[PDB]
């Protein structure tokens, strides 16, 4: 609704000093011809200069020299706030000096060769930060701000004095611009970047609103995650997008000094952060400054921790200075930092997923030409344990594989450096395969909290089970008020029990896929590692990962493992209690019904499990997963076979009726064996064909009609003889006896 | 401030301390406050620097000198009494100790009132529910919650319109109100509860909540109410009141509820320690923690101490008979050592509970330790009706039900066995309501009727249908053989 809130669009006058008009809008403005109009955009950088060299284009979209997009803006669709401020003072003059492309060739004076013919009767109505193109030649070189005799911008005049003593530089300014791009330079942390925005934008952008009222903003943010996850980059991207000053402090440069100087170095940053407010102070690898008392041995190492704490509390008066720190885990630092007023907030950056990895690949390979057969969707699927930098390395390594393999001797002496070889060259899929398979040792071994991809259709039958799951997990999230109305408290646990390989691990993922919630999976070997290592504290950490990622689902399987280890089913003299389930119960009981955290347990030996875990407020509800029926068997056959060429004379309906009691595991083994037979036959045929005509005196014979394009009935018939049942009737008798003895077993 | 002293050198630190003491003396009557005392004076085992030990002695000398001069008083704040040196806890330096503990529902509500004064609220606040749902939070947490809830609404509106309308003024600034939905969002999303340790407070359960059991109520009031109310009567005669009681019986009969009903009747603090804590102490070989518990009770008098799953340790090692070892362990010995060395005047009562008295060590049943035993039997018909009414006094229900018919239809049941039936019936009703509502909303959306509202709550209350359906799964829990064993133990005495 703001009248001067209008889009900006393409421009044709290669001189940036021109700014457009819109006669219907000029009638709204007081736009006069002369020196300057203040056209205001983002980040406070403007393009202020002479005006009215337009009205060639339509209205509602001001024509502004495209070079004032990288500056003052980012892209199209933006909006300008054009308001005249002509008649600026006439100081001495504005700086003259190039930046990047002038040292390349004759330099002379850098003013009187190429730039002099442009400050003619248009004597630079400008604003420091306006960047453009001006030359007396190839017509592509920048003109940047270096000096400022008058603080506000002016209109130059002859007879002045200029010193091109300055030297053209690198893209310090371009790096600053890349940082300014910010949100469009990262991927895989969509949630974590939205939480920060809503947390810091309001204090920084409109501090007056917070001044007018008494409310408490944040003064400490802590980001913990594995290395190489783009944390300092996030801080720079957030500081630049809001225009707030950014100061960087690193740990090693504070612990590599002498005592007094080291302490005093930490007080200059705060002093050079309050005189540039609103500003941000960023400290990385805080673990190198303030670790726990276990790793803090020495007196001077404590004089530097108390100094930091007393400095943090000196900001309660000032609400426009914010501190963000980075580390790996939160328990690696003194808890005194984690307090109310020092580092209250927390953020888990985490690890990207297929979508985030694909986004990172896209950004990293933007200028990297890729000819063909580069999907980048597959690549994101085989990268399990890669973070940030690693992918970048990948993108470089493959590129090297492109040139190192064949350009090894071509580029030695035949030619000098040229672009027709660099641009003409491309990157293929084989380079990516060699780079990923050969020299990519992932640096990750931690747990993963992300939504899976398994859908309901992958599982067969069990409609009642799915209905029950929806009633338990899905209903409360949508109708909390209905649950409250009847004075009800929903359950927070469920236990699966049944024979092995009947489809219990898939349900925990399908439910999360439908609910759009993260899931965490824990195996029995981890529980045995805790039992033998006698480290039950890790359990707390596990639950901590189920509290900061809500809503989510927590899955425990092979729960009987510990009860199996010590003696048989009954075990040794000792009862059914141990030192690892006690902690699980303790953590379960000390948890609120809110936060939407669900827990699922799986096992195949219900009898041995501690009866104290099925009390109310614990895994109260029990579900019996049975062996699939013939109709379910054909469903599982279709599910497994859908992702292979398996058109055949035989029919899966024929196979299912022959099977009797086959578990789901057996039905994912027939296909594997049949495909193995088919691929062996194909390989043998290929080798014999490739060998015969060349070993024979036949120079050239061509025939490639695929001998094995699909899985035929013969392969399935051969495979059917190599597979049988993998369970005994006695187990089914035990399961049904337990399913009935629950009658009055409470 | 502790760190401000540790962030300097010896001369500067031990000059500021002295100067502060002189300044406090000059402006008498004055007060000195110290925080983060652990950062200054922890136990010597954790101190290595010679300067660190040279900064504690100065404080001791100043504290000793204070007694001679002026009216200055000194107050210090610490996280736990044991975290600091024991030389400060003497006669003349820090003789007096105090605990702050944690606020209760009333305290949380009061803090919300304090922090909501100048803020504008709607009619949907109902801070009582928030206080009930606010478990573990403290004052800072509540202030943060209030600020976050305000910022939710403020950021929603501000980001939407008035960035361009006009320079924000007081009228629009204060025009905005707050709604309970923002509170619920701030509570569910931001829930960094900073409390996971023990708790001490007066419970809310009352005798009316319990079903029947009048004789045990009479037998309980005599043990607790009479000594506190009438000591001179005991003094006139020669008896000294006992300080322990043990409940033995089958599970699901309300043993846990009596220990809190007594406290609610007498308005006394209550503490409950569960069996998992005992097993955690056993495996960790940490019997010292026990002592701390009693100290808390000693400082929370009048109070009641509760222990359940007391037979858990004996069950763990071997079965009822156990392994080769006897009936003793590492924790019960400490409990006896603490009980024997306790004064009667502190009026700290002790309650234990179990369902397998056969394997409890007899040493705890000796005179002076849990000498009075009470048996909690299975609820009867007249009791069962009361339990049903008590559990159903919170939910809306129809009138076709025949509660007495259900009560008589049940035999050998437990209190929980009826609460589970009520929960199952409520689940059936909620599922029916959800299905009906979703089907209704889905059917007419295809029919483009702008106005079609036959709004009737499909099933406000439940009938005999759901209760009889749940009766199919409603079945006995405790075996008759177990009841016979309990009776045999109750007769062989
Ligand atoms: N209903 C089913 N649909 C599809 N696959 C199944 C089904 N039941 C079992 N499976 C197969 O069994 C494997 C998973 O076994 P799982 O059920 O986790 O064993 P357990 O029950 O011992 O945990 C999967 O590879 C899957 O192919
Ligand atoms: N006499 C009773 N009056 C009210 N509720 C009861 C009664 N007996 C059992 N309950 C129900 O049982 C549940 C708690 O059982 P509890 O008495 O704690 O087990 P135990 O007796 O094994 O310690 C409560 O939800 C309570 O409503």
Swiss-Prot record, chain B:
Give the recorded effect for residue 43 to A: Does not affect methylation by VCPKMT
Which superkingdom is the protein from? Answer: Eukaryota
Q: Which residues carry this modification: N6-succinyllysine?
A: 399
Where is it mainly found?
Answer: cytoplasm
Describe what happens upon changing residue 45 to A. Does not affect methylation by VCPKMT
Specify which residues bind ATP 1 according to the UniProt entry for this protein: 79, 115
Give the catalysed reaction(s), semicolon-separated. Answer: ATP + H2O = ADP + phosphate + H(+)
What does the subunit section of this Swiss-Prot or TrEMBL entry state?
Homohexamer. Forms a ring-shaped particle of 12.5 nm diameter, that displays 6-fold radial symmetry. Part of a ternary complex containing STX5A, NSFL1C and VCP. NSFL1C forms a homotrimer that binds to one end of a VCP homohexamer. The complex binds to membranes enriched in phosphatidylethanolamine-containing lipids and promotes Golgi membrane fusion. Binds to a heterodimer of NPLOC4 and UFD1, binding to this heterodimer inhibits Golgi-membrane fusion. Interaction with VCIP135 leads to dissociation of the complex via ATP hydrolysis by VCP.
Put simply, this protein is called Transitional endoplasmic reticulum ATPase
Provide the species name: Homo sapiens
Q: What is the lineage of its organism?
A: Eukaryota, Metazoa, Chordata, Craniata, Vertebrata
Full-protein positions shown: 270 to 762 of 806
